[PDB]
Amino acid sequence: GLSDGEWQQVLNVWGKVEADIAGHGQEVLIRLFTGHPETLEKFDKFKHLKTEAEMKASEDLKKHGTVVLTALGGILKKKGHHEAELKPLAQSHATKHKIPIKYLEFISDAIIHVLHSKHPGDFGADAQGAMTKALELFRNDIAAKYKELGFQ
Ligand code: HEM
């Protein structure tokens, strides 16, 4: 898994997100939707967002960004002992939302991008390495549950 030092870096980076969780969450989703428009189609309630300006102006998009990053933050704070938090999310995303594991890769990449965009020069090589490992662990544990379910 991750070392104690690596987890410390992850949670330090997470403090930066927590200062503006809605702002980070909004930017993560906009990065996801604009880079991969197929992802928007998974959200009946964001389908109407035909432009990035409309996305930016959407308070509901921001609200969902908050929900998403709040859940992720909870999982990260468990430092890999996250089965109870992660299993239900994996199951909802496979069975109800029908989100392929590829889209979780896309959103992981979007998180890394947004961290660099909002914290340029303040999200160093060590920090990126640690956050990347944590998001890979998250994705991998979801993928294990997806396999159980035969999803995708
Ligand atoms: C960091 C990764 C993600 C986290 C932590 C996360 C978390 C959540 C949470 C907590 C909910 C509400 C509870 C639930 O339905 O399980 C939710 C809903 C949902 N998620 Fe995710 N999610 C992630 C990635 C994604 C991705 C990549 C997609 C699609 C590309 C997606 C699609 C959806 C949809 C369609 C809903 C229902 C939205 C609604 O209509 O209210 N999620 N997510």
Domains and CATH numbers, the chain: 1-152 (1.10.490.10)
Tokens of 130: 């640690």
Atom of ligand 1 nearest to the CA of 135: 1
Give me ligand 1 centre to Cα 68, in Å: 6
Please indicate if the annotation marks 119 as binding a ligand.
no
What determination technique applies here?
X-ray
Helices (H), the chain: 4-18, 21-35, 52-57, 59-76, 83-95, 101-118, 125-149
- Ordered DSSP codes for 12-27: HHHHHHHTTHHHHHHH
Resolution in A: 1.3
- Are residues 112 and 13 in contact, defined by beta-carbon separation less than 8 angstroms? no
Q: Which of 109, 87, 81 is nearest to 1 (CA)?
A: 81
